[PDB]
Design a protein around this ligand. Structure first.
Ligand code: WNM
Length: 460
């Protein structure tokens, strides 16, 4: 039985509005309704992995897992295995997988982050799940961010707290937050970003939705605008939105948006908005293709509609040679030439690099770089030809060209990371000097750039 080089992943996000679901929710898992929907011909084909994020979920874990497993059984005739379930207050994530994957899945981690302070600590935050699928690391984040049209800055703060403090994936990757720990990271939930148009325009917005004319609404979506200004979700992807706003509906129909201010809303307007979202970030040059992104039309127990997204995702096999694991492959080597970091920092400490990769026995520390002042005020840290030669555990090109090197640039004085990035080994050529580049981030904000040349030697 061959190991796969591709899997499909279903991502669902649903704010349930503290109501039990209806008897049938299969449309969600089939990616049927509005937007980019799944072909009828695929209906019986199970996804490899289903990841279900709920918010305002009133069910026990037992009650929800029964409903989910029943739904998938009815669609696929497959009894899915529970990989992980984790709940913080009424925020929940469930990961289900085909039984044939049970011995492909390992290193399962769960965590949560509670956002805010005092007044604003008690119901918002995130849950997450990570695991290895053969040689591929997968992370999943379900967040319920701060509500309200006038709190986009609070949402951006909630995002930074979640990516700083959610403890998933390989704890040895100590310089790296969740935005660097995974081959594929999916981040979804009730992110609560709103369409920023005047209150008086509510009926105009409703008209536009009835005409399926979303362009003048999406141009005011706070998540799109904050992402374009690099305020949140830097280096993440989102599929184009082609479905109606998923919030705020009258329950038991989808015919009416309930937007007017009420005592129940704290006298706040809820203009129709794309609150419910799926984003992803994969390592450079790894296959990831969104094959659906939409909302259901027939599940109406909540004031939100469910959102689905599905993906093709490249995966690699648990590689064994005669040498690695448990030793290196003399044939293999990674050389860095003419490398330099450009940092936005005002500090003047010396810096060194750490190279982290599951293709190395353990992480590699460089010598300190040579600081120079850049023309336009910047710090340039030069490494020249001084960087260590990295010795991968396996030299087979079918393995090594699929790997990635995480880079952290750390202060000699404090040993704190000033920037993190990732370099793909999926090169155009081996035994050849080739340009490499990554942006550097810290706490998910841009801090600099790393660039230079690489020379990769494989057994071929
Ligand atoms: N124990 C009972 C309670 C819920 N389940 S169920 O399997 O998820 C299910 C849900 C809706 C229709 C048919 C079956 C059966």
């Amino acid at each position: 039985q061959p190991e796969p080089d591709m899997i499909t992943i279903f991502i669902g996000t649903w704010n349930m509005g503290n109501a039990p679901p209806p008897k049938k929710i299969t449309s969600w898992f089939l990616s049927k309704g509005q937007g980019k929907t799944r072909d009828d011909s695929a209906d019986y084909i199970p996804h490899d992995i289903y990841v279900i994020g709920t918010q305002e979920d009133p069910l026990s874990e037992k009650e929800w897992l029964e409903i989910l497993k029943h739904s998938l059984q009815e669609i696929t005739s497959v009894t899915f295995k529970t990989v992980a379930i984790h709940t913080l207050w009424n925020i929940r994530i469930v990961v289900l997988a085909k039984p044939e994957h049970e011995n492909r899945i390992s290193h399962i981690c769960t965590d949560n982050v509670k956002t805010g302070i005092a007044n604003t600590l008690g119901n918002k935050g995130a849950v997450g799940v990570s695991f290895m699928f053969n040689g591929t690391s997968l992370g999943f984040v379900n967040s319920h961010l701060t509500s309200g049209s006038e709190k986009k800055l609070r949402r951006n703060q909630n995002y930074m707290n979640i990516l700083r403090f959610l403890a998933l994936g390989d704890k040895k990757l100590s310089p790296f937050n969740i935005t660097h720990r995974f081959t594929h990271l999916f981040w979804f939930g009730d992110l609560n970003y709103r369409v920023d148009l005047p209150t008086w325009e509510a009926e105009t917005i409703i008209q536009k939705i009835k005409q399926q004319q979303y362009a003048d609404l999406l141009s005011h979506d706070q998540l799109l605008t904050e992402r374009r200004e690099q305020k949140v979700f830097l280096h993440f992807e989102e599929e184009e939105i082609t479905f109606a706003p998923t919030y705020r509906f009258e329950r038991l129909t989808r015919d009416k948006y309930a937007y007017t201010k009420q005592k129940a809303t704290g006298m706040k307007y809820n203009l129709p908005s794309w609150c419910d979202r799926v984003l992803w970030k994969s390592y450079p040059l790894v296959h990831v293709v969104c094959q659906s992104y939409g909302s259901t039309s027939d599940i109406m127990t909540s004031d939100h509609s469910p959102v689905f997204a599905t993906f093709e995702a490249g995966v690699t096999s648990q590689f064994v040679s005669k040498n690695g694991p448990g030793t290196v492959d003399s044939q293999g080597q990674i050389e860095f030439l003419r490398c330099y970091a450009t940092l936005k920092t005002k500090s003047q400490t010396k810096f060194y690099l750490e190279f982290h990769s599951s293709c190395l026995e353990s992480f590699v520390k460089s010598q300190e770089g040579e600081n120079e002042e850049g023309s336009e005020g910047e710090l340039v840290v030069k490494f020249g030809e001084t960087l260590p030669k990295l010795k991968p555990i396996i030299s087979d090109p079918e393995y090594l060209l699929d790997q990635h090197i995480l880079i952290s640039i750390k202060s000699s004085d404090s040993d704190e990371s000033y920037g993190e990035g990732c370099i793909a080994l999926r090169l155009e050529a081996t035994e050849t000097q080739l340009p490499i580049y990554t942006p550097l981030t810290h706490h998910g904000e841009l801090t600099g750039h790393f660039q230079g040349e690489i020379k990769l030697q494989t057994s071929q």
